[PDB]
Design a protein around this ligand. Structure first.
Ligand SMILES: CCCC[C@H](NC(=O)c1[nH]c2c(c1C)C(=O)CC(C)(C)C2)C(=O)NCc1ccccc1
Ligand SMILES: CCCC[C@H](NC(=O)c1[nH]c2c(c1C)C(=O)CC(C)(C)C2)C(=O)NCc1ccccc1
Ligand SMILES: Nc1ncnc2c1ncn2[C@@H]1O[C@H](C[C@@H](N)CC[C@H](N)C(=O)O)[C@@H](O)[C@H]1O
Ligand SMILES: Nc1ncnc2c1ncn2[C@@H]1O[C@H](C[C@@H](N)CC[C@H](N)C(=O)O)[C@@H](O)[C@H]1O
Ligand SMILES: [Zn+2]
Ligand SMILES: [Zn+2]
Ligand SMILES: [Zn+2]
Ligand SMILES: [Zn+2]
Ligand SMILES: [Zn+2]
Ligand SMILES: [Zn+2]
Ligand SMILES: [Zn+2]
Ligand SMILES: [Zn+2]
Lengths: 270, 268
């Protein structure tokens, strides 16, 4: 079966680079049961706090490469290197990028996520997991890949929705909990599958607002990724504790934690 | 002779598509820094702008939105863009948005795609800072947006300095202003001309909250390199300001000079 290219760009030119779709596995048409959006949306009143006078910001007159940068200091247990790659210490990390209140320029060293997708990605048909996303180039460890984009909703709203297959929990620790639901509105991330041996990780980020209800979710590679490799993150135990009643993990890794067999082994262990 | 100094390579600090340099060949005034340059409108208290994506009117085009079937074009009042992104023509523009089925590069995206022409902030002889063209700008070309702090009418009324205040002129409902005094972009430096070469146009892009049109300047004629950009601030501005200073635009048909004022008072 020939690998058919069935959409030149599922993002319709909204990203820095196109994200084509191919299918060399079956007859499934390009997915159209969602609306592609490149930035988060709301379908009820969220009213993100964007008061420019309440943004924490820096006064740097350089490129914000120094440890004196306030925005760098606000970042929790992570920092960027000269090439825009993310380094960690590992309480989950938290990135404060520079913003419109900072004295610095738009091209300072603390602007990776807000500058958008730089790597070549592809939406493709997997053998066993439906649609997936893979790299069309080599990607070094620590590289920004893409943002988890979708519809901002309350945890209360998320609990009553019928389909939770595209639901991301922001897990706010101070204040009410919100989610990003990519079921009806989402970007390329909605198609990223779960891997027990993941090669990307989600990281909370603040950029042009610092409304603590709504960290934005950035994926960075957690290791060097090879051309053609499927992208995947660890959805987490909570997802599988719920979903395993319907289906189990097919990531196929020797380290798979969520297969029928793995779950049975964890049960007998407990 | 005093010669011209380049005193800032880019007053926008890289936030626009192109740099906007500042020069001074007139006096010793330094680069203006009594404001914060912002490339898009800000809030300092919330305006509760309706950003609900399901409230957007949007089109179903999969071409370049050049056809008469584009709902967004059908929404747009007494104006439309040509294939070069130039405005033909009080107009009200609805650009395509994130709910439309079209691509980000369709023909109805001119203002949201930002500054394309080369502008310079420069020191004028008599009118403080001004903005001039560094290139030929054909009639109908998008120049820049009037950017600043969104505030209520009531807030506008208590503010000391109204020299950078733009009235959105909502005919119905709640009244708002853009104050570029504390936060603004290159538009805050555009002077008044009695023979203007740009016009402000109301535009909707990523939201359609009708209380908050965004203000886009388009050239109203072919503009040549070196020409100072200016719009007609309007009579309301001058009815207030003329007591403090008169118009220095130098037009043969200046409406607000000391000379023009002397005639008006004489007639009455
Ligand atoms: C399809 C989406 C992936 C599954 C998903 N995972 C996450 O939401 C999630 N949230 C966080 C992480 C992760 C993986 C982190 O690593 C750290 C954090 C601070 C960024 C917070 C999930 O649990 N959704 C809620 C849910 C959906 C369906 C059934 C049950 C529960
Ligand atoms: C520095 C700003 C220029 C002066 C200014 N002009 C305008 O606000 C204005 N508003 C509109 C237009 C104009 C010129 C239009 O053409 C049509 C429109 C639909 C775009 C509405 C103004 O009146 N500000 C309020 C004000 C300030 C100081 C004293 C008195 C009043
Ligand atoms: N490791 C996995 N094993 C089995 N199914 C998976 C796995 N990861 C993702 N899925 C499937 O994909 C859904 C999650 C989606 N966000 C991913 C995109 C999805 N594959 C699609 O075609 O739309 C899950 O609810 C499963 O149906
Ligand atoms: N035609 C004009 N004649 C005299 N002064 C003007 C004229 N146009 C603008 N100004 C001056 O500029 C102010 C409006 C500003 N938005 C323009 C930028 C201003 N020239 C500056 O240096 O900051 C007015 O309040 C006047 O002080
Ligand atoms: Zn800094
Ligand atoms: Zn910075
Ligand atoms: Zn900063
Ligand atoms: Zn697995
Ligand atoms: Zn259209
Ligand atoms: Zn449209
Ligand atoms: Zn369009
Ligand atoms: Zn005049």
């Amino acid at each position: 079966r020939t690998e058919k290219i069935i959409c030149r760009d599922v993002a319709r030119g909204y990203e820095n680079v196109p994200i084509p779709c191919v299918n060399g596995v079956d007859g499934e048409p390009c997915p159209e049961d969602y609306k592609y959006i490149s930035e988060n949306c709301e379908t009820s009143t969220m009213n993100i706090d964007r008061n420019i006078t309440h943004l924490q910001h820096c006064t740097c007159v350089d490129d914000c490469s120094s440890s004196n940068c306030l925005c760098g200091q606000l970042s929790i247990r992570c920092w960027y290197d000269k090439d825009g790659r993310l380094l960690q210490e590992f309480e989950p990390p938290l990135i404060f990028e520079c913003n419109q209140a900072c004295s610095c320029w738009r091209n300072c060293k603390n602007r990776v996520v807000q500058s958008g997708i730089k790597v070549r990605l592809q939406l493709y048909r997997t053998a066993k997991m439906g649609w997936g996303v893979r790299a069309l180039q080599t990607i070094p460890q620590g590289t920004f890949i893409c943002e988890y984009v979708g519809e901002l909703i309350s945890d209360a709203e998320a609990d009553v929705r019928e389909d939770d297959s595209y639901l991301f929990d922001l897990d706010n620790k101070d204040g009410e909990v919100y989610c990003i639901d990519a079921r009806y509105y989402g970007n390329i991330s909605r198609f990223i599958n779960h891997l027990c041996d993941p090669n990307i990780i989600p990281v909370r980020v603040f950029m042009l607002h610092q409304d603590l209800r709504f960290p934005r979710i950035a994926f960075f590679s957690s290791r060097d990724i090879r051309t053609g490799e499927e992208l995947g993150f660890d959805y987490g135990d909570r997802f599988w504790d719920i979903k395993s009643k319907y289906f189990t993990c097919q990531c196929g890794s020797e380290k798979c934690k969520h297969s029928a067999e793995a779950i049975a082994l964890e049960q007998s262990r407990l």
